[PDB]
Design a protein around this ligand. Sequence first.
Ligand SMILES: C#CCCCCCCCCCCCC(=O)SCCNC(=O)CCNC(=O)[C@H](O)C(C)(C)COP(=O)(O)OP(=O)(O)OC[C@H]1O[C@@H](n2cnc3c(N)ncnc32)[C@H](O)[C@@H]1OP(=O)(O)O
Ligand SMILES: Cc1nn(C)c(C)c1CCOc1cc(F)ccc1-c1ccc2c(c1)c(CN(C)C)nn2C
Ligand SMILES: [Cl-]
Length: 385
Amino acid sequence: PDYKFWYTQPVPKINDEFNESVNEPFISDNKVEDVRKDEYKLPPGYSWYVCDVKDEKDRSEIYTLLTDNYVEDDDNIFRFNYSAEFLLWALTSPNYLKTWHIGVKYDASNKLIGFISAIPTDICIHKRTIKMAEVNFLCVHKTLRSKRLAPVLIKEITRRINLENIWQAIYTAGVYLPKPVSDARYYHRSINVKKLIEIGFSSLNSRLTMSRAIKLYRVEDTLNIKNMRLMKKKDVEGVHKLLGSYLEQFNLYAVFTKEEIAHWFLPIENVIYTYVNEENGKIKDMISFYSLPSQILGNDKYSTLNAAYSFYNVTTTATFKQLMQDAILLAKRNNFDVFNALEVMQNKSVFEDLKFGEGDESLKYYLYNWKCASFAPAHVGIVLL
Ligand SMILES: C#CCCCCCCCCCCCC(=O)SCCNC(=O)CCNC(=O)[C@H](O)C(C)(C)COP(=O)(O)OP(=O)(O)OC[C@H]1O[C@@H](n2cnc3c(N)ncnc32)[C@H](O)[C@@H]1OP(=O)(O)O
Ligand SMILES: Cc1nn(C)c(C)c1CCOc1cc(F)ccc1-c1ccc2c(c1)c(CN(C)C)nn2C
Ligand SMILES: [Cl-]
């Protein structure tokens, strides 16, 4: 590929590799006063719109755009169906800016046809903590693809982020762009076997009949960690200590404040599930996963694949395998069809024994305006929604 847009940006070229001693911006000594104050030009008939995600109607417009036009798998069987409540949660983390929730409308219909978002977070990359924007939910309507709208959205959110004296960003994508700092395959653990077979997600054969498949993935409805329970507000301090200490081992992670722990982990039904094990009033283990359904395209019987996505999991009183087995059980108890996880943190070590299967694509991790050594995904300690 030519990367005609991306090679104008402060990112590595596709062949760039850096030693471990390199960990710095491509462009330093940036000045807020020099940042463009004018919005990037859109094609005629289109206008910028500042979305208010706390307004139900604006939020529902983003929801509809994404439901109809957001990420599909490689085979166009599934399309992500983030719920409106999920989008509210994902976009209103501590210190969020409404002006970083950027829509594009088609003037004649007043309809949203494009979106991009960012939230602020402190990111530790190779032991150096940098204030960054986390970019997500970039979407252009299917009818307007390949018209170079996405670089306009990217340049406009870059401009707005730079106005806040922030010069780095983290983002993930499935497409290969210049240039990943890490690449993580995803793995799936079947829960509702029959449904997964009926929609083509899973397969049978003459050895693995339907009944044998169901038996293979059967789970015992008893926790390894008996007192694992839904997180409560009182647990924020202990989760902050447990997770914050755990994450320091990785090459890439968010440095969460207590306010961020409360936001990202306190349970919201059909959005975010966090469970904790409290011993002596101290939090010693945690499980978390978020709800991300995929619409099943064209299916007559099922509209939705109800998937739970591994988020952050820490154990000090059990094995990581026992902890993730409990995560699968808790996902089953909450009526999820499948448990999805990336090969980040310690996850890959449990995939074989817990009967995960390898998926057909991977998620790449990227930094904007940062040069450093890349790393295997076991060194990644951050999950983007
Ligand atoms: C400091 C501060 C810095 C802040 C900025 C940091 C950088 C942020 C980059 C964006 C990160 C996005 C993270 C995500 O949210 S993940 C989910 C992506 N959401 C989807 O997968 C939904 C379905 N899909 C779509 O809605 C569209 O395909 C897209 C993704 C909007 C792309 O639009 P389309 O009409 O195809 O393409 P056009 O407008 O002609 O633009 C082509 C140029 O664009 C590049 N590109 C494509 N996909 C990208 C993508 N996902 N992220 C970034 N760049 C992407 C591509 O390479 C090319 O540029 P070149 O010529 O190669 O240099
Ligand atoms: C099921 C299913 N449904 N769909 C629609 C897909 C792609 C699958 C496969 C299953 O993907 C995953 C499974 C995991 F454990 C973890 C991550 C993904 C994943 C893959 C590609 C991704 C995204 C998320 C996102 C969303 N954040 C991260 C920006 N963007 N991209 C391009
Ligand atoms: Cl139990």
